[PDB]
Design an enzyme around this catalytic site. Structure first.
Site, PDB file in Angstrom:
ATOM      1  N   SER A  18       3.704 -12.028 -60.029  1.00 46.97           N
ATOM      2  CA  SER A  18       4.815 -12.035 -59.599  1.00 46.97           C
ATOM      3  C   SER A  18       5.645 -10.752 -59.146  1.00 46.97           C
ATOM      4  CB  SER A  18       5.740 -12.999 -60.371  1.00 46.97           C
ATOM      5  OG  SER A  18       5.155 -14.440 -60.584  1.00 46.97           O
ATOM      6  N   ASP A  76      13.521 -16.193 -53.701  1.00 47.44           N
ATOM      7  CA  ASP A  76      12.807 -15.551 -54.951  1.00 47.44           C
ATOM      8  C   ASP A  76      12.631 -14.117 -54.565  1.00 47.44           C
ATOM      9  OD1 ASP A  76      12.000 -15.057 -57.477  1.00 47.44           O
ATOM     10  OD2 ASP A  76       9.896 -16.278 -57.006  1.00 47.44           O
ATOM     11  N   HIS A  82      13.019 -14.891 -60.063  1.00 47.74           N
ATOM     12  CA  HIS A  82      12.436 -15.677 -61.348  1.00 47.74           C
ATOM     13  C   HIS A  82      11.909 -14.931 -62.310  1.00 47.74           C
ATOM     14  CE1 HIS A  82       8.328 -15.242 -59.694  1.00 47.74           C
ATOM     15  NE2 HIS A  82       7.950 -15.291 -61.008  1.00 47.74           N
ATOM     16  N   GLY A  84       1.568 -13.189 -63.657  1.00 47.05           N
ATOM     17  CA  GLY A  84       1.508 -11.821 -64.084  1.00 47.05           C
ATOM     18  C   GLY A  84       1.661 -10.947 -62.654  1.00 47.05           C
TER      19      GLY A  84
HETATM   20  N1  7IN Z   1      -1.321 -17.097 -55.182  1.00 44.56           N
HETATM   21  C1  7IN Z   1      -1.011 -18.032 -56.467  1.00 44.56           C
HETATM   22  N2  7IN Z   1      -1.729 -18.973 -56.488  1.00 44.56           N
HETATM   23  C2  7IN Z   1       0.063 -17.967 -57.304  1.00 44.56           C
HETATM   24  C3  7IN Z   1      -0.131 -18.459 -58.624  1.00 44.56           C
HETATM   25  C4  7IN Z   1       1.283 -18.132 -59.385  1.00 44.56           C
HETATM   26  C5  7IN Z   1       2.042 -16.990 -59.294  1.00 44.56           C
HETATM   27  C6  7IN Z   1       3.344 -16.718 -60.104  1.00 44.56           C
HETATM   28  N3  7IN Z   1       4.376 -17.421 -60.082  1.00 44.56           N
HETATM   29  C7  7IN Z   1       4.538 -18.605 -60.826  1.00 44.56           C
HETATM   30  O1  7IN Z   1       3.663 -18.809 -61.711  1.00 44.56           O
HETATM   31  C8  7IN Z   1       5.772 -19.405 -60.831  1.00 44.56           C
HETATM   32  C9  7IN Z   1       6.726 -19.181 -62.018  1.00 44.56           C
HETATM   33  O2  7IN Z   1       6.475 -18.137 -62.821  1.00 44.56           O
HETATM   34  N4  7IN Z   1       5.368 -20.862 -60.943  1.00 44.56           N
HETATM   35  C10 7IN Z   1       4.549 -21.675 -60.237  1.00 44.56           C
HETATM   36  O3  7IN Z   1       3.984 -20.873 -59.061  1.00 44.56           O
HETATM   37  C11 7IN Z   1       4.470 -22.934 -60.220  1.00 44.56           C
HETATM   38  C12 7IN Z   1       5.058 -23.731 -59.094  1.00 44.56           C
HETATM   39  O4  7IN Z   1       6.411 -23.429 -59.018  1.00 44.56           O
HETATM   40  N5  7IN Z   1       3.146 -23.322 -60.282  1.00 44.56           N
HETATM   41  S1  7IN Z   1       1.797 -23.274 -61.342  1.00 44.56           S
HETATM   42  O5  7IN Z   1       2.170 -23.992 -62.346  1.00 44.56           O
HETATM   43  O6  7IN Z   1       0.691 -23.734 -60.635  1.00 44.56           O
HETATM   44  C13 7IN Z   1       1.699 -21.403 -61.647  1.00 44.56           C
HETATM   45  C14 7IN Z   1       0.470 -21.273 -62.554  1.00 44.56           C
HETATM   46  C15 7IN Z   1       0.189 -21.902 -64.082  1.00 44.56           C
HETATM   47  C16 7IN Z   1      -0.839 -21.627 -64.811  1.00 44.56           C
HETATM   48  C17 7IN Z   1      -1.876 -21.161 -64.485  1.00 44.56           C
HETATM   49  C18 7IN Z   1      -2.003 -20.537 -62.846  1.00 44.56           C
HETATM   50  C19 7IN Z   1      -0.709 -20.665 -62.093  1.00 44.56           C
HETATM   51  C20 7IN Z   1       1.917 -16.286 -57.994  1.00 44.56           C
HETATM   52  C21 7IN Z   1       0.856 -16.706 -57.116  1.00 44.56           C
END
Ligand code: 7IN
Length: 247
Positions: A198, A97, A46, A196
Site C-alpha cells: 500500500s 486513497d 488509509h 504491505g
Molecule cells: N493487488 C492486490 N490484489 C492488492 C491487495 C491488497 C492491497 C493493500 N490494501 C489493503 O489491504 C486494503 C486496506 O489495508 N484493504 C483491501 O484491499 C480490502 C478491501 O477493501 N480487501 S482484502 O481484504 O481482500 C485485502 C487482503 C487481506 C488479506 C490477504 C490479502 C489481501 C493492495 C493490492
C-alpha cells in the site's frame, strides 16, 4: 509483491519506506511511497488514517532492506502529514486513497539527489497510458497471502493496465471501481501487489518518461483470478496535489 523479483533501491530510486515508532521503542513498517519532489513524498491515506500523528513516523529514502541499513540511505521526520478529506472505505473500494508527507532531516533539510535517491515525474492532466500498457510496482509487501511477515529485500514486478470497462464487469469489481481508480494485473494472475505494498508506486513509461501513474490502494485477496489490483489514479488528483504542496 506476489511473485516478481528482488531488486535494489538503485533500480527504484524514488521509492520511500515509511515506518511508525511505537510507545515502547520498536519501529514497524507501515507503507511504501514515492518521492515526487525533494521535500514531498506521496502515499496512501488509509496507511495513516488511524494514527494521524506526524511525530510517530519515519521516512527512509535510499533504503533497499526492511530491517537493516543501506549505505547512502537518508532518514527523515515528517514535517506535515496531509490526508485526503474525502477518504472513505466501502465494502472493498477505498476512495481518494492518497496522502502527502512533507519530509525534513534532523538538520531541517529535504532529500539530496544521488544514485539511490531521485524524484519520479507526475502525470499530466488526464493523460494516462493506454490500457494494455505494462507498468511496474515496487514494495516490501507480502510474498504470499498466508505470510504474516514481510520480505527483507525490496521486490518489484510488472503488471498490465486494465480498462475501466473490463474492471467494472460483474466477475471483477462491478460498480465499486470508479474512474478515479486504475486496475492493473498480470494476464496470468501470477504476480500482483499485496498487503504491505500500500502507498507504493505504479510506474509506467509514458512517452519515454517514467511516470507515477498509480498508488497501490486495494484489491480482493492477492493474485486472485479476475481480481486486479486497484490503484489511486494520480492524474486525477493533480489539483489536490498542487494546492497542498504550495504553502
Ligand atoms: N493487488 C492486490 N490484489 C492488492 C491487495 C491488497 C492491497 C493493500 N490494501 C489493503 O489491504 C486494503 C486496506 O489495508 N484493504 C483491501 O484491499 C480490502 C478491501 O477493501 N480487501 S482484502 O481484504 O481482500 C485485502 C487482503 C487481506 C488479506 C490477504 C490479502 C489481501 C493492495 C493490492
Amino acid at each position: 509483491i506476489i511473485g516478481g523479483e528482488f531488486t535494489t533501491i538503485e533500480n527504484q530510486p524514488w521509492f520511500a519506506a515509511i515506518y511508525r515508532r511505537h510507545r515502547g521503542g520498536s519501529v514497524t513498517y507501515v507503507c511504501g511511497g514515492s518521492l515526487i519532489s525533494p521535500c514531498w513524498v506521496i502515499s496512501a491515506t488509509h496507511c495513516f488514517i488511524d494514527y494521524p500523528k506526524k511525530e510517530d513516523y519515519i521516512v527512509y529514502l535510499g533504503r533497499s532492506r526492511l530491517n537493516s541499513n543501506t549505505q547512502g540511505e537518508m532518514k527523515f521526520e515528517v514535517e506535515n502529514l496531509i490526508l485526503h478529506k474525502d477518504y472513505s472505505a466501502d465494502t472493498l473500494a477505498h476512495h481518494n486513497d492518497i496522502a502527502l508527507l512533507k519530509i525534513r532531516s534532523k538538520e531541517g533539510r529535504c532529500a539530496q539527489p544521488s544514485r539511490t535517491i531521485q524524484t519520479i515525474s507526475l502525470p499530466s492532466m488526464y493523460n494516462d497510458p493506454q490500457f494494455g500498457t505494462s507498468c511496474e510496482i515496487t514494495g516490501f509487501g507480502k510474498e504470499n497471502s498466508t505470510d504474516y511477515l514481510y520480505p527483507e529485500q525490496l521486490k518489484m514486478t510488472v503488471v498490465k493496465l486494465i480498462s475501466h470497462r473490463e474492471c467494472q464487469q460483474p466477475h471483477y469489481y462491478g460498480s465499486e471501481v470508479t474512474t478515479k481508480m486504475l486496475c492493473a494485473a498480470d494476464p496470468q494472475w501470477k504476480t500482483d501487489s499485496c498487503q504491505g505494498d500500500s502507498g507504493g508506486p505504479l510506474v509506467c513509461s509514458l512517452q519515454g518518461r517514467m511516470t507515477l501513474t498509480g498508488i497501490v490502494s486495494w484489491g480482493r485477496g492477492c493474485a486472485l483470478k479476475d481480481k486486479p489490483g486497484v490503484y489511486t489514479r494520480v492524474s486525477h488528483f493533480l489539483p489536490w496535489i498542487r494546492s497542498h504542496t504550495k504553502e
